[PDB]
Amino acid sequence: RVSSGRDLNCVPEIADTLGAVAKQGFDFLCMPVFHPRFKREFIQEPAKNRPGPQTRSDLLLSGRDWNTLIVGKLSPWIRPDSKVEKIRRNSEAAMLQELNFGAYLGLPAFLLPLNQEDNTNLARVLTNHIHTGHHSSMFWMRVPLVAPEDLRDDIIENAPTTHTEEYSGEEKTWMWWHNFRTLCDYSKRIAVALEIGADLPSNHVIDRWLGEPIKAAILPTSIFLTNKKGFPVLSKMHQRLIFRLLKLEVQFIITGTNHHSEKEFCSYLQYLEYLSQNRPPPNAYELFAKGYEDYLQSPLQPLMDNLESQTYEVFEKDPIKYSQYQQAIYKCLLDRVPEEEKDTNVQVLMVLGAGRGPLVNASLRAAKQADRRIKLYAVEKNPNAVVTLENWQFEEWGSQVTVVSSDMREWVAPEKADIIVSELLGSFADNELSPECLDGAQHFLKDDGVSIPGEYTSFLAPISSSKLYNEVRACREKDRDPEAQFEMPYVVRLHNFHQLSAPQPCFTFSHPNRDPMIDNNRYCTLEFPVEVNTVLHGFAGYFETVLYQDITLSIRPETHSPGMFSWFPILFPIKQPITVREGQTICVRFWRCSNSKKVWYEWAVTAPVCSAIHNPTGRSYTIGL
Amino acid sequence: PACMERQLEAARYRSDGALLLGASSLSGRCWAGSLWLFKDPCAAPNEGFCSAGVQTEAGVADLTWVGERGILVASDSGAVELWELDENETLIVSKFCKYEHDDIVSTVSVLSSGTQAVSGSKDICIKVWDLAQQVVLSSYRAHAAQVTCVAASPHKDSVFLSCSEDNRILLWDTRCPKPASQIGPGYLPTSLAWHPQQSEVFVFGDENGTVSLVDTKSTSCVLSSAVHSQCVTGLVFSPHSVPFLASLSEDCSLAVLDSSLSELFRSQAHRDFVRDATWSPLNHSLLTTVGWDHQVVHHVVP
Numbered sequence A: 001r002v003s004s005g006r007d008l009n010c011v012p013e014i015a016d017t018l019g020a021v022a023k024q025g026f027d028f029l030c031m032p033v034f035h036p037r038f039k040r041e042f043i044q045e046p047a048k049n050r051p052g053p054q055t056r057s058d059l060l061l062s063g064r065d066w067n068t069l070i071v072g073k074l075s076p077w078i079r080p081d082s083k084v085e086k087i088r089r090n091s092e093a094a095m096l097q098e099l100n101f102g103a104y105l106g107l108p109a110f111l112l113p114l115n116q117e118d119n120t121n122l123a124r125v126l127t128n129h130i131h132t133g134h135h136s137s138m139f140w141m142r143v144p145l146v147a148p149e150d151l152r153d154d155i156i157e158n159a160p161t162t163h164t165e166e167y168s169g170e171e172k173t174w175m176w177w178h179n180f181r182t183l184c185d186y187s188k189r190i191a192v193a194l195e196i197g198a199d200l201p202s203n204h205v206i207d208r209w210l211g212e213p214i215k216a217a218i219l220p221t222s223i224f225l226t227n228k229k230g231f232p233v234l235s236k237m238h239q240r241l242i243f244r245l246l247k248l249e250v251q252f253i254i255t256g257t258n259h260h261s262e263k264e265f266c267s268y269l270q271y272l273e274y275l276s277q278n279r280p281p282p283n284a285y286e287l288f289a290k291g292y293e294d295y296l297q298s299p300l301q302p303l304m305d306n307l308e309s310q311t312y313e314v315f316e317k318d319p320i321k322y323s324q325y326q327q328a329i330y331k332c333l334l335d336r337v338p339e340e341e342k343d344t345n346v347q348v349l350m351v352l353g354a355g356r357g358p359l360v361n362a363s364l365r366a367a368k369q370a371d372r373r374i375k376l377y378a379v380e381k382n383p384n385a386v387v388t389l390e391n392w393q394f395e396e397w398g399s400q401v402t403v404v405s406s407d408m409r410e411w412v413a414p415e416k417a418d419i420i421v422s423e424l425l426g427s428f429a430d431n432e433l434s435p436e437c438l439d440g441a442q443h444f445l446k447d448d449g450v451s452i453p454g455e456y457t458s459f460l461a462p463i464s465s466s467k468l469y470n471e472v473r474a475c476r477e478k479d480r481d482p483e484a485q486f487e488m489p490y491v492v493r494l495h496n497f498h499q500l501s502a503p504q505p506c507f508t509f510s511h512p513n514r515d516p517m518i519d520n521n522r523y524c525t526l527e528f529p530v531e532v533n534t535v536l537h538g539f540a541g542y543f544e545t546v547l548y549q550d551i552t553l554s555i556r557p558e559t560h561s562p563g564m565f566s567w568f569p570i571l572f573p574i575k576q577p578i579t580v581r582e583g584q585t586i587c588v589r590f591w592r593c594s595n596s597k598k599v600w601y602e603w604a605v606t607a608p609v610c611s612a613i614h615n616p617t618g619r620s621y622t623i624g625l
Numbered sequence B: 001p002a003c004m005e006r007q008l009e010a011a012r013y014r015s016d017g018a019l020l021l022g023a024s025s026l027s028g029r030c031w032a033g034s035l036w037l038f039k040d041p042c043a044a045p046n047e048g049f050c051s052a053g054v055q056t057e058a059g060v061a062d063l064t065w066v067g068e069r070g071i072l073v074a075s076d077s078g079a080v081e082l083w084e085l086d087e088n089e090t091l092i093v094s095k096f097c098k099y100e101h102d103d104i105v106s107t108v109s110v111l112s113s114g115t116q117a118v119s120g121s122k123d124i125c126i127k128v129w130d131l132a133q134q135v136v137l138s139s140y141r142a143h144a145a146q147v148t149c150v151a152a153s154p155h156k157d158s159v160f161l162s163c164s165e166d167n168r169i170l171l172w173d174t175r176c177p178k179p180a181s182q183i184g185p186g187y188l189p190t191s192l193a194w195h196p197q198q199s200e201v202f203v204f205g206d207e208n209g210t211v212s213l214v215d216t217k218s219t220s221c222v223l224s225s226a227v228h229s230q231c232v233t234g235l236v237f238s239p240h241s242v243p244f245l246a247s248l249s250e251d252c253s254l255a256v257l258d259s260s261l262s263e264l265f266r267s268q269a270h271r272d273f274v275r276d277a278t279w280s281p282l283n284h285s286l287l288t289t290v291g292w293d294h295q296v297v298h299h300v301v302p
C-alpha cells in the first residue's frame, strides 16, 4: 500500500471537504490554513486594523485530525524575497503568522515553495521560526524537477525557448534546494516535496535528487496519460521514477482537478496502488535488511568486548555464508588428501573464533562430503559462547572436537594444523582485526598449511547523501570532541544515497603471510572519476574474500553474494561536504594505522579540494588489540 | 441568500444601469462566494434591497458581465463558470461550471464579440473559451509564474493582454502561430486596462503603485507616475470622450487620472482594500467602488 494525500487550494467547508477526500481513499490532505487570496497588511493603516477573525477556528477539527490528516500550506502571496520592501516586510510577518498557526494547530507537516533562485530571506524567516518555541513540525519544500520557466510552451514569438542543451542550467532546480537547505544549516526538519512535471527531464538531473531527504512526491493530475478505456495511467519512464520513489517510501500527493471526468477521482490513486502492488516482491537479502535502512551503528570492539547470545543467533541464520564455508573446506580436503589415503591421513582442522560452533558443524559436514578424516580444535575467546561449545561437544561432537577457551594469539597448540578456518571479517574486511589475529596464530599452521579464508580485499566508493550526512551530524554527544562523530566509520545498510563512482580496491591481506618483516599498516591513494555534479559526504566500504580457490564471499554490490545479510556496508564520513562538478576526479587517501595496543584508519580527500586528515592518531576511533 | 459575504471582490455596471456584485468569504467557517444584482445602486450592499442573488460553491476571484444577462465567474475551485440571469431577472441560474484549471482562477475577460472569453489562473495557464459551446478551444502555458490579469482587447476578438508574476507583459494574437509577444526589470505588473478608443494604447499598474502608459507599436514606455503607495489592484477607464482613469490600490484608496496621468480625485472612503471600480453608464461623473470593508461607495468626479 502507498501512503498518499490530496493537494487542494480551495476548501469551502473543512468538514465536508475532508470527508469527500477520505471517501476517495486519501490518507491525508494538503490545504491552506488561511484563505490563499486573503492578503493581510501588518504595517500601514487602515488595512492594518482589519477586524477578525483572521482565519477558520481550530475547533472545527479534532486534535487528532489536525495531527494526522492536515498538511498546512503557505499562502502563495507570501513573498519574503520580493524586490519591493513593503511586500518583503509584510510577507515576513505573514510567514511567521502562518507558520506559528500551523505549530499552534500541531500539524505534522507544512508546505513551502521553492519557485525562484533567491530564497535567502525565506530561509532566514523559516530558520528563525525553527528556533522559536518547542515544536516537532516537519517542513516540505515544494520544488519541481523542471523549473516552470523551462516547461513553457514555445509560443512567445519574440522570446523563444532555448532549445540548445545546458547541462547545468537543466539542473538549476536542485541548486535552488541546495542553497536553501545550506542556509538553513541542514535542519532535520526541512525535507523535499518533489514536483513531477509532464515531461521528465534528462536522467542526470533526475539523479541529482538521489540521497536527498525526499518525504513527498507531487503528481499533477495533468501529467497522466489516458488509456483506451479512458482511465488515468503513466508513461513507462514515469513508472520508472515512481518505482524508485516507492523504494524510498515517500508519500504521494495528487494535485490539480480531475481531467478524466468520466471516472471517479480515486482512479488516479488506484493506479498508484496498482503500481505499488506491482513492484517485484522483496528478495532474500531485502527481507532481513528491511528496517535497517540508513540506520547507523557505532564501531564495536571485536576483541575488547564479547558478543551477546542473540547476535550469534541472528547471524547463524545466513543462507549462504556457512554453505560457502562448508564447500571451501570440502574442496581443500580433496586437494590435501588423495583417494588412496582416505583412511591413513587424518587432517587437523582448527576453527579460530568458533562462536557457538556453526563452522565446526560445517567442518564435520564437509568431512562426510569429501569422505575424509579430520581432527577438530575449536578455539574461542568469548567464554560465554565457549559455554555453548562445550555443551555442543559433550552432547554431540565428542572426542573429535577439542574445545579451547582462549585467544588464538595466546594459545599454545599441542600439534600444528593442516587448515585454520576463521571468520573474523568486518564490513571493510580487515576492520575487525582479522589480519592481526591470524598473524599471531600462523605459527601453529604447518609449513604447507591452508588458511581459510586465503585472502580478502576492501573496496571504497564515494557517495552523496545529505540524508546520511545529517544522521552522522546528529551523533554528537556530551563529554567528547564535538566533531568526533565524523571521524569514525559506521556500519549501515546504505539506502537513500548516490554512488558517485565505481568501487575500487583499497586494502588486501593474504593468509598465511610468510613475508619476512610482517607489516599490516597500509597507505593507499585512489582516484574516482565523477561524471555528474554532486556533493560528496563520504565513502562507502565493502569487501570481497577468497575462502578457497573459486569459493568466495562479497558485499561489493557488483559481485554481491546472493541473500547474504551478514554484512552491511560501512560508511566513512567527512567533516565538511565537498562540492564536485561533472568530469572532476575525487582523490581519497586511506591509511591503516596501528601500535601495539590498537589499530585504526585515517583518511583525507585531496581532490578536487583537501579535507582535514580524519581521525589522526585514532583520536576519535580505534579498534583495541 | 439571507446574508452576503464580507469581502466584496468585484463591481460592474450593466448598460441598462443595474449593478452586479461579486463577493467572497475569505475568513470564518465557510469559504465561499455569492453573486448579486442590484437594480438600485444606492441600495447596495444591502441583502434586503436587491433584485437577485445566488450562492456559489466557492469564492469569487474575478467576474464580468457576458453581454446583458450572462455572468462569467472565476472561481477558487479552479473552475470557470457561467451564470444565466432570469428573464424575470429575479433568479440567477448556473449555465456551465467547468473544472479545467488546476488552481484558483484569478482573472477573466470577455472578448469583443461576446461569444468567447479568456481566463488566467495560478496554475500559470491561460485558456480561451467558447461560451456558447462550453469548452476550451485553446490552452496556453506561456508564463512562468501565476497569471495576475488578462484583458481582452476592446474591438479585436483574437487580441488580448496578460501579465504575470514572471514579470512578463504579453500581447496576444491567436492569428499568429506563436500567439504571444513580450512587451518590455520593472516591478511585477498587476493590473491591465486597454484604452477604450485608441486600440494601440494600454495602461498597466505594478506592485509598487506605479501606473504606466504604453504604446504597443512604439514599446518605449511613454509616461509613468507614482500614483499609489501599494500594489495597483485594478484600472478602469471612464466612458468619456476624452476618458478618465480610475486607479485602485491596496493602500485603501482610489485615484482618478487624466490622459497625462495627473491626479484629479482621491478618496480614502475605504478602510480596507479597494477591489474594483465601475463607472455609471447613466451618470458619467458617478463612479462606484467596492472594498473588503464591505462598503459600496459612490463618487462624484469633477
Ligand SMILES: O=C(NC[C@H](O)CN1CCc2ccccc2C1)c1cc(NC2COC2)ncn1
Residues within 6 Å of the ligand: A288, A289, A292, A297, A307, A311, A312, A314, A315, A316, A355, A425, A426, A427, A432, A491, A565, A566, A567, A568, A569
Ligand atoms: O555488518 C554488520 N556487522 C559487521 C559484522 O562484522 C558482521 N558479522 C557477520 C557474521 C557474524 C557472525 C557471528 C557473530 C557476529 C557476526 C557479525 C551488521 C549486519 C547486520 N545485518 C542485519 C541483521 O540481519 C541483517 N546487522 C548489524 N550489523
Ligand SMILES: C[S@@+](CC[C@H](N)C(=O)[O-])C[C@H]1O[C@@H](n2cnc3c(N)ncnc32)[C@H](O)[C@@H]1O
Residues within 6 Å of the ligand: A302, A303, A307, A312, A315, A316, A352, A353, A354, A355, A356, A357, A358, A359, A379, A380, A381, A382, A385, A406, A407, A408, A409, A423, A424, A425, A437
Ligand atoms: C564474527 S565471529 C564468527 C563466529 C562464528 N564462527 C560464526 O560464524 O557464527 C568471530 C568470533 O571469533 C572470536 N574471536 C575474535 N577474535 C579472536 C581471537 N583473537 N582469538 C579467539 N577468538 C576470537 C569472537 O569471539 C567471535 O565469536
